[PDB]
Coordinates of C-alpha atoms in Angstrom, one line a residue:
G14 CA 30.8 0.6 -8.2
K15 CA 29.8 -0.8 -11.4
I16 CA 26.3 -0.9 -13.1
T17 CA 25.1 -1.7 -16.7
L18 CA 21.7 -0.2 -17.6
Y19 CA 19.6 -1.6 -20.6
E20 CA 17.0 0.0 -22.7
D21 CA 14.7 -2.8 -22.9
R22 CA 13.6 -5.5 -20.4
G23 CA 15.3 -8.8 -19.6
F24 CA 18.8 -7.3 -20.2
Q25 CA 18.3 -6.5 -23.9
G26 CA 18.6 -3.7 -26.3
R27 CA 21.4 -0.7 -26.1
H28 CA 23.2 -0.8 -22.8
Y29 CA 25.5 1.5 -21.0
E30 CA 28.2 0.8 -18.2
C31 CA 28.6 3.3 -15.5
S32 CA 31.4 3.3 -12.7
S33 CA 30.6 6.9 -11.6
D34 CA 28.0 9.6 -11.5
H35 CA 26.3 10.5 -14.7
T36 CA 24.2 13.6 -15.2
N37 CA 22.7 13.0 -18.6
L38 CA 22.2 9.4 -19.9
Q39 CA 20.1 10.6 -23.0
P40 CA 23.2 10.6 -25.3
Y41 CA 23.8 7.0 -24.3
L42 CA 20.4 5.5 -23.5
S43 CA 17.0 6.6 -24.7
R44 CA 15.1 4.7 -21.9
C45 CA 16.0 2.0 -19.3
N46 CA 14.0 -1.0 -18.5
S47 CA 16.7 -3.5 -17.0
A48 CA 19.7 -3.1 -14.8
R49 CA 22.7 -5.3 -13.7
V50 CA 24.4 -3.7 -10.6
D51 CA 27.5 -5.5 -10.3
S52 CA 28.7 -3.4 -7.3
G53 CA 28.1 -0.3 -5.2
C54 CA 24.9 1.2 -4.2
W55 CA 23.1 3.3 -6.9
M56 CA 20.5 6.0 -7.2
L57 CA 18.6 6.3 -10.5
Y58 CA 16.6 9.4 -11.6
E59 CA 13.8 10.0 -13.8
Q60 CA 15.2 13.3 -15.1
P61 CA 18.6 14.6 -15.7
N62 CA 20.7 16.6 -13.1
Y63 CA 19.5 14.2 -10.4
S64 CA 15.8 15.6 -10.6
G65 CA 12.4 13.8 -11.0
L66 CA 11.5 10.6 -9.3
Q67 CA 14.3 8.8 -7.5
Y68 CA 15.0 5.0 -7.1
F69 CA 17.5 3.2 -5.0
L70 CA 19.3 0.1 -6.3
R71 CA 21.7 -2.2 -4.6
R72 CA 23.9 -5.2 -5.9
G73 CA 22.0 -7.8 -8.1
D74 CA 19.9 -7.9 -11.3
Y75 CA 16.9 -6.0 -12.1
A76 CA 15.0 -7.5 -15.2
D77 CA 12.2 -4.9 -15.4
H78 CA 11.9 -1.2 -14.1
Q79 CA 9.3 -2.4 -11.7
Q80 CA 11.9 -4.3 -9.8
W81 CA 13.4 -1.1 -8.6
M82 CA 9.9 0.1 -8.0
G83 CA 10.0 2.6 -11.2
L84 CA 7.0 4.3 -12.1
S85 CA 8.3 4.5 -15.6
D86 CA 11.3 3.4 -17.8
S87 CA 12.8 6.8 -17.6
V88 CA 16.2 7.0 -16.3
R89 CA 18.2 10.0 -17.3
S90 CA 20.8 10.5 -14.6
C91 CA 22.4 8.1 -12.0
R92 CA 24.7 8.4 -8.8
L93 CA 27.1 6.2 -7.4
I94 CA 26.3 6.6 -3.6
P95 CA 29.6 7.2 -1.6
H96 CA 30.3 4.2 0.8
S97 CA 30.0 5.3 4.5
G98 CA 31.0 3.1 7.5
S99 CA 28.5 4.7 9.9
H100 CA 25.3 6.6 9.7
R101 CA 23.8 9.4 11.9
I102 CA 21.0 11.7 11.1
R103 CA 18.8 14.0 13.1
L104 CA 15.2 14.9 12.0
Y105 CA 13.4 18.1 13.0
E106 CA 9.7 18.8 13.7
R107 CA 10.1 22.2 12.1
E108 CA 12.5 24.0 9.6
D109 CA 15.7 25.8 10.4
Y110 CA 16.4 23.0 13.0
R111 CA 13.6 24.0 15.3
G112 CA 11.0 22.0 17.3
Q113 CA 11.2 18.3 18.4
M114 CA 14.5 16.8 17.2
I115 CA 15.0 13.0 17.1
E116 CA 18.3 11.2 16.2
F117 CA 18.7 7.9 14.3
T118 CA 21.6 5.5 13.8
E119 CA 19.6 2.6 12.5
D120 CA 16.8 1.9 10.1
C121 CA 13.1 2.7 10.8
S122 CA 10.3 1.2 9.1
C123 CA 7.7 3.3 10.9
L124 CA 9.1 6.8 11.6
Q125 CA 6.0 7.7 13.4
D126 CA 7.0 5.5 16.3
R127 CA 9.9 7.7 17.6
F128 CA 9.6 10.8 15.4
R129 CA 6.1 11.3 16.4
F130 CA 5.2 13.6 13.2
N131 CA 3.9 12.9 9.7
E132 CA 6.4 15.4 8.2
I133 CA 10.1 16.2 8.5
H134 CA 10.7 20.0 7.8
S135 CA 14.5 20.0 8.2
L136 CA 17.3 17.5 9.0
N137 CA 21.0 17.3 9.4
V138 CA 22.9 14.3 8.1
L139 CA 26.0 14.0 10.2
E140 CA 27.3 10.6 8.8
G141 CA 26.5 8.4 5.9
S142 CA 23.7 8.5 3.1
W143 CA 20.2 7.7 3.7
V144 CA 17.0 7.1 1.7
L145 CA 13.7 8.8 2.9
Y146 CA 10.6 7.1 2.0
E147 CA 7.2 8.9 1.7
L148 CA 5.3 6.0 3.3
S149 CA 6.0 3.4 6.0
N150 CA 7.8 0.1 5.2
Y151 CA 10.0 1.8 2.5
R152 CA 7.4 2.7 0.0
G153 CA 6.3 5.7 -2.1
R154 CA 8.6 8.6 -3.2
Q155 CA 12.3 8.1 -2.5
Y156 CA 14.8 11.0 -1.6
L157 CA 18.4 10.4 -1.5
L158 CA 20.3 12.1 1.5
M159 CA 24.0 12.7 2.0
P160 CA 26.0 14.4 4.5
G161 CA 25.1 18.1 5.0
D162 CA 22.7 20.4 6.3
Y163 CA 19.1 20.4 5.0
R164 CA 17.1 23.4 6.5
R165 CA 13.8 22.7 4.6
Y166 CA 12.1 19.8 2.6
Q167 CA 12.8 21.3 -0.8
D168 CA 16.8 21.0 -0.1
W169 CA 16.2 17.2 -0.7
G170 CA 14.2 17.7 -3.9
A171 CA 10.7 16.9 -2.4
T172 CA 7.3 18.4 -3.5
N173 CA 6.2 17.9 0.2
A174 CA 7.6 17.2 3.8
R175 CA 5.7 13.8 4.1
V176 CA 8.1 10.9 5.4
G177 CA 7.0 7.5 6.7
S178 CA 10.4 5.5 6.8
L179 CA 14.0 5.9 6.3
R180 CA 17.0 3.5 5.5
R181 CA 20.8 3.6 5.6
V182 CA 22.6 3.0 2.5
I183 CA 25.1 0.2 3.0
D184 CA 27.5 -1.6 0.7

């Protein structure tokens, strides 16, 4: 993957080019208001060490930070999401993989259709990376998911367990 991040809008100011994960962009970029994603699917973070608010970007040009649905021009770490050729996730009613479980292999704009709860308290990502969204139709806070066990909502860096929609990461 390849992404060039810029300090000012419309692809201006000091820029920095990534081809892999970066834990701290503050040495290279003091802010970020535009981005050209040449290839790969990326996940930008408000704070260093993949913390704070998360934003998902795919191939194409972002002239302003609102284009990746950014709440600010703060981007202080970024992750090249690993390609995956299939996706499979299991969501659970309660933590420790208890209660109602539902399995997904496709995207869902309204999670409350099939998984008839307003919160996910644990989940298992069996294949691929996903983006959880706080609200329906891919809005609100985003949480990047990768293969592995998540026994509670804090494991995916969320303040609460609220989830309305989920997408597969495809590149």
